[PDB]
Amino acid sequence: LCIKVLQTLREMMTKDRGYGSRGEMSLAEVQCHLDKEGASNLVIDLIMNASSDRVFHESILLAIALLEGGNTTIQHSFFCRLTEDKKSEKFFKVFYDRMKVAQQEIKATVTVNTDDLEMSAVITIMQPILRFLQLLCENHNRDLQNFLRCQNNKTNYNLVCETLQFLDCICGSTTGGLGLLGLYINEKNVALINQTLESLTEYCQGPCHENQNCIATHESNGIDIITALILNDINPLGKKRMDLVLELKNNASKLLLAIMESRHDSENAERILYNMRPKELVEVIKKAYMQGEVEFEDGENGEDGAASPRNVGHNIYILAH
Amino acid sequence: LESTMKLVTNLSGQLSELKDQMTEQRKQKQRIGLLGHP
Amino acid sequence: LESTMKLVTNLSGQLSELKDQMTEQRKQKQRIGLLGHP
Amino acid sequence: STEYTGPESYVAEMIRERNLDWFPRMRAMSLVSSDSEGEQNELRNLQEK
Amino acid sequence: MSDKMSSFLHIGDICSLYAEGSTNGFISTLGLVDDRCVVQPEAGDLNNPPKKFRDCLFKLCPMNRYSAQKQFWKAAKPGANSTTDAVLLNKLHHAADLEKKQNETENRKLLGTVIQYGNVIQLLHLKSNKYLTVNKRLPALLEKNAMRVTLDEAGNEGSWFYIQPFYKLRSIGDSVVIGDKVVLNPVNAGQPLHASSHQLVDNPGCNEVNSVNCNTSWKIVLFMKWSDNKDDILKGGDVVRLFHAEQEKFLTCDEHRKKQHVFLRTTGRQSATSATSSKALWEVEVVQHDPCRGGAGYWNSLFRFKHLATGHYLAAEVDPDSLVSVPEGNDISSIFELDPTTLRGGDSLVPRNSYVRLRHLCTNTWVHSTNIPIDKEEEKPVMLKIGTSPLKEDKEAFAIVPVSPAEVRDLDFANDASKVLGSIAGKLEKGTITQNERRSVTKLLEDLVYFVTGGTNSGQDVLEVVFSKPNRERQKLMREQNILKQIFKLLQAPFTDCGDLRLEELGDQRHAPFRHICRLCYRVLRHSQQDYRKNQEYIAKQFGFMQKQIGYDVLAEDTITALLHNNRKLLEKHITAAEIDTFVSLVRKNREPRFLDYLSDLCV
Amino acid sequence: SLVSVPEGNDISSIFELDPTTLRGGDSLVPRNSYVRLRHLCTNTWVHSTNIPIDKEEEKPVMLKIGTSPLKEDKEAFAIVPVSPAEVRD
Amino acid sequence: SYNYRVVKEILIRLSKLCVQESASVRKSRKQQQRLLRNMGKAEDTKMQEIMRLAHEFLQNFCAGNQQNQALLHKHINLFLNPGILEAVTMQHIFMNNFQLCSEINERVVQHFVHCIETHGRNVQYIKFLQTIVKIKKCQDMVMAELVNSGEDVLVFYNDRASFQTLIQMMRLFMYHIHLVELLAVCTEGKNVYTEIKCNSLLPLDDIVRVVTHEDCIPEVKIAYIN
């Protein structure tokens, strides 16, 4: 009974669909109505009373309802009650729990390259979790959420920012120093790694404290495993992955941009340097020939996004400074 | 200079206390032995 | 002042350890003597 | 509206409110302002503790 | 005992395990090429550890993620038959070793850590350097329930353990202590390991470890602390070759006459590896004042030192009738004391590496070197006896020479070969054993064929490319041991099998067992040819087997091996056998149209 | 044993207690977790055995507490602090 | 516990009844059968007996249908690693030939290939493997397990094998002979693997079988022509 009732809320937040003293609907207004209810305690206690596998895998889908564009009051909404009362380790561990389960599944997943291959249910849960975390963290600059990567529940139950990193480290095979990075790149799995990529970058942007330790200090090796996407190109040169490798690289240098964001720091840059080679400017120059290999397209990178082949080098040239 | 001297000196001083404690322990043990005595 | 105090103090402290070691050495020597004993 | 993370989107957050106060008005220079020494002094107290 | 907070158990420390309850004793690995664990049921307890149980020693480690390496290993072990090249495999090969090397770094980054109940353990063996685990299979050959004891080098496949006490004294996440009757259990097998109640076809003091639901509460027992290791010092687990400087050794052999002998091999130079193994290996142990056999002596040891081939100690009659061969030594007359000799002592307390002098137990007697022989030997050209007398001096020092652990782990490997191959070779020529042991004796030899070359194989039988790498110390190890003799004995046993010719009844009929072992045999014997003449001194024995070769087997290259290197003085005995008239007469007796071999003998 | 003696200025009523991983040379601190027992002056090991008294005429389960100088690591039992609010009730 | 035993007995009876008119039975039960499949401790107890009974019933209730036999096509790997005992009945039950030819991967080929090594003796597992072979389309799939390793069980005991054969004649061994026959049946002619396999095994048998036939057994005479 409670599932369709929760599923009723997801349709109620569903908007921009079905159109072809009456109140004028505002997407911001729709979010505001939901916020007026503030009935985020239904999510704020739903994971806290998390038992239904359909429920926790469904309530995060309800979490995109308060999220997904607005969250001005909504980001302020989760902030206060999230530091509210005595459920934090019971809640953050509950999300943490999913991360641990996912890591085990990922470790035990596919093996090697010598009606389709279906992803694990735990893996699918992971995409929703990643998105939820990203949305909450992101608000255009989320001060308090950034502070919230740590928490004062004593125990503290996680460092979910660094807890993001290992799950982000896991999907690329985590130890493949290199060429098996292409051996780890999953043509059906990259869409997971895509949203799995940007959610780290959204964890970084802005203040250099909370991301700054978790850039390359976190001791989960894979900072260079982050930058390994800059290090080379994918071995399966797919068609939809041709834009996807661009989309990967478009997701790639975004994370590198948040790598060095506030300068006047030595060792943090050395983490970008300690695994990298000085000849990568010629690799950046290889993108200049890759962008030199760009065909007759008028691509301008302003307003909503687009992957420029030169634009990735244009992104990569930012690592020059 | 102060750090090394502090360290060596400190270590030696701390180490000594130990002899003294065994002898002291024995005295009370002798009292218990005396009560054990028939 | 700290250097001279460190020096004198340090020397005395280091010097003492030495007495203790001889006595300790003897105890184990007594154990060997006991086995040597016929 | 998904611009270009905060140290860019700071100034977009400014520009609606007219208040001029984000250019390096007098003080910046980006010159040395040598701070290694203060850290050295902090390390030096360490000895006192 | 001036402890404040120590004596718990720590990562980076060596130890030993002990069985309790239905079965009692230690855990060892009888055999060094073998894989069977063993539990001696009778000889060991808490206060009296028996003689040979240096081999029971277990070293503790951090974990070591098995995965990348497992993938490489899995790719390498075939059946797929394809989807492999240097772009995939060899680019994964150097993608394996450096991330294998960081496990060795993290090994050296945990010198001491209080071990809590529940974490990884990753137990490891001292002498083998080849640690144990199980698999998630069911190859449990005596009691048929779900286990296997595999001693492995790479080994990171279910070798993670999790540890708990038997009793509810401590909890999960508390410091262990020495004497904790712990449980021990693989993290993915689920079944904790157990002391079985079975025997098998070996010595009657045999048993093994199974892994079942029920429990065997193991007390560890400790005799070594950490942060004191190889580290240019001596511990209670080392070996040593005590060499002098008058003549830089002393000898120890078992004589059939009751006295035993310290003859000097006509020279002693440089204190090198140029030495007979059996005469030289003594171990150094401490007493620790404890019934448990201890370690880490740090001055005032009242040490004693034990022989390796047989189990005996020192002893001495001070004036009357030293290298007195006493098996059991809990007395005073087997325990010595040692000299300062410029390491000045009031409270020196540090066991250095360079030089010592001797003094016996309790009388403090001066061990020296005299000028007399025993003269039972009936004119050996040079010999001196070792006598002792309480006259003090500064003359008869001799050095604590540390032996590398890589050389002692090659010594017993050669010893374990003769203790296996030297027994089985007489019986399969006499009767029939399991045919799977013919498979087992194959990789016994196939582990040996690149042992002596010193390098792990890439192909299967490519023994000609590693031929350009000699090392005299391994062949001298194989010369001084009896392996060569045994292998030639094995050749004759199959010759007798054909008799009870060689190509016809043994080679032409079966083609599987006998041709392959001779190919295993011939290239080993070819490998000893190219280094020194004392291997070629054995050709004054292995000339009759090449006299009787007739299967066209692989053995003809040994004739080239005897002859490829020009021997003028070896041939002075080799051709100096004069049976070339038989040998080329055998070539003339080879009256088939195959004449080329005869031409080759003439050519030599 | 649970021998019920009213007055105890003798030796046979006064015990000594075990370190049990609180290592002692000069430890000198009375912790809270776990102890083992040893009697007075003989330093006797207090343990737990498997026999009942069997005066009880088939109680379903019962064990007697016996002591014997065989040392062990098994029969520890905890100093459990009781709150003073419960003893005053 | 008592109630649970009764249900298993009832289920076996029901399975037989359902079996006597298969389409109807499967359709009616595709619900109950699905529940039973979902249901499908380690000791000789009421749970052990129930497991054995369930396997037998399934073998019968699974045996009637092929699309319903395809309906239980998932979750079948739960017995392939088990190597020994009750899993074999289910494996035997799974075969109708057209369906078998149409659908099997190579991930169970080593699932009995390693099951050739470990996982008990597998007496009926050779027939459990030969039924998995079932048809040179599976003979092309049978060359891979014949290509991978030698496990057989003393099968190719040449002179030693002859001595073993003499022991077998004196007094298991027949099962081993049957397994050898099954391997030979799998052999068949050309494939790359097939041709090669036929060759090594054939030469060995010709020298030996020509010899075994001469020193003959009666059940060995039945399989030796195979």
Can you give the resolution of this entry in Å?
3.9
Q: Which residues pair with E238 in a beta bridge?
A: E284
Token code pair at residue E389: 């007398």
Question: Which helix (H) or strand (E) segment is A166 a member of?
Answer: helix A160-170
Is G160 part of the contact surface with chain E (CB cutoff 8 Å)?
yes
**Which among A107, A113, A175 is the nearest to E99, CB-wise?**
A175
Rounded Cα distance between A47 and A54, Å, is 11
E strand or H helix that includes residue A252 = helix A240-257
E strand or H helix that includes residue E596:
helix E596-603
* Single-letter amino acid code for the residue at E141: L
Measured between beta carbons, the chain B residues lying within 8 angstroms of C14 are 8-9, 12
C-beta separation of G198 from G136 below 8 A: no
CATH class of E13-222: mainly beta
Q: Is F9 on the interface with B (CB under 8 A)?
A: no
Alpha-carbon span A34 to A28, nearest angstrom? 10
SS3 of E437-466: HHHHHHHHHHHHHCCCCCCCCCCCCCCCCH
Q: Which residue type does E366 have?
A: W
Q: How many C-beta atoms surround the C-beta of residue A20 within 10 A?
A: 3
User: From the candidates F18, F23, F34, F71, which should be mutated to test the interface with E, based on the most E CB atoms within 10 A?
Assistant: F23
> Which of A6, A164, A158 lies closest to A90 in space, CA to CA?
A158
How many interface pairs between B and C have CB atoms less than 8 angstroms apart?
24
- Would you say A202 is a known binding-site residue? yes
In this structure, chain D runs to a length of 49
Contacts of E385 (CB under 8 A, 6+ apart): E262, E370, E372, E373, E374
SS3 state at E408? helix
Closest CA to A246 of A209, A194, A173: A194
Amino acid at A113: N
Contact criterion met (CB < 8 Å) for F21 and E177: yes
Which segments of A38-156 does DSSP mark as H helices, in order? 41-44, 53-66, 72-82, 88-107, 121-138, 143-147
What type of residue is A276?
M
Of F10, F25, F41, the CB nearest to B18: F25
B7 to chain C: closest CA residue: C10
Gaps in chain G (C to N over 2.5 angstroms) fall after: 40, 134, 171
Q: Torsion-angle region of residue E454: left (phi > 0), alpha (psi -120 to 50) or beta?
A: left
Q: CA-CA distance, A141 to E127, in Å (whole number)?
A: 60
Nearest to E26 by CA among E50, E47, E56, E48: E56
- Reference A134, options A81, A63, A228, A42; nearest CA is A63
G124 in E contact zone (CB under 8 Å): no
Q: Is E19 helix (H, G, I), strand (E, B) or coil?
A: strand
Check D5 against A206: CB less than 8 A apart: yes
Q: Which residues in chain E touch residue C36, judged by CB atoms under 8 angstroms apart?
A: 332, 361-363
Contact A141 D3 (CB under 8 A): no
Q: Distance (Å, rounded) from C-alpha E333 to C-alpha E325?
A: 12
Dist. CA E45–CA E52, nearest whole Å: 14
Please tell me the distance in Å from A205's CA to the nearest CA on chain D.
6
Is E139 in CB contact (< 8 Å) with chain G?
Answer: yes
Which of C17, C21, C31 is facing E289, going by the closest CB pair?
Answer: C31
Enumerate the residues of chain D whose CB falls inside 8 A of the CB of residue A140.
3, 6, 9, 13
Q: If we measure between CA atoms, which residue out of F87, F43, F82, F49 comes closest to residue F65?
A: F49
- Tell me which H or E stretch contains C4: helix C2-36
Can you name the residues that pair with E304 across neighbouring β-strands? Answer: E285
Query: What does the angle CA E214 – CA E217 – CA E223 come to, to the nearest 5 degrees?
Result: 150
Chains that touch A (3 or more CB pairs under 8 A): D, E
In chain B, what residues touch C1 (CB-CB under 8 Å)? none
Nearest to A258 among D2, D5, D9 (CB): D5
- In chain E, residues with a C-beta closer than 8 Å to the C-beta of C31 are 289
**Do the Cβ atoms of A177 and E98 come within 8 Å?**
yes
Helix intervals (H) in E35-90: 67-76
- Closest CB to B18 among F26, F40, F41: F26
Instruction: Return the CA Rg of chain G.
Output: 20
Q: Do E179 and F21 touch (CB under 8 A)?
A: no
Instruction: Judge whether G192 is closer than 8 Å to chain E, CB to CB.
Output: no
Helices (H), chain G: 2-19, 22-29, 32-39, 46-63, 67-71, 77-80, 87-93, 97-102, 109-117, 125-133, 136-148, 159-170, 173-187, 192-214, 219-224
C-alpha R_g of chain E: 28
Residue E374: partners with Cβ closer than 8 Å, 6 or more residues away: E259, E261, E383, E385
Q: Is residue E361 less than 8 Å (CB to CB) from chain C?
A: yes
Q: What amino acid is encoded at E163 in this protein? A: I
B7 has a chain C CB within 8 A of its CB: no
Chains G and F touch (3+ CB pairs under 8 A): no
* Residue E409 annotated as lining a ligand binding site: no
Query: Distance between CA atoms of E146 and E139, rounded to whole angstroms?
Result: 6
| Residue A234 and residue A169 in contact, taking contact as beta carbons nearer than 8 Å | no
Give the DSSP H or E segment for A73: helix A72-82
> To 10 degrees, the CA torsion angle through C11, C13, C17, C20?
130
- Asked if E362 lies within 8 A of C31 by C-beta distance, the reply is no
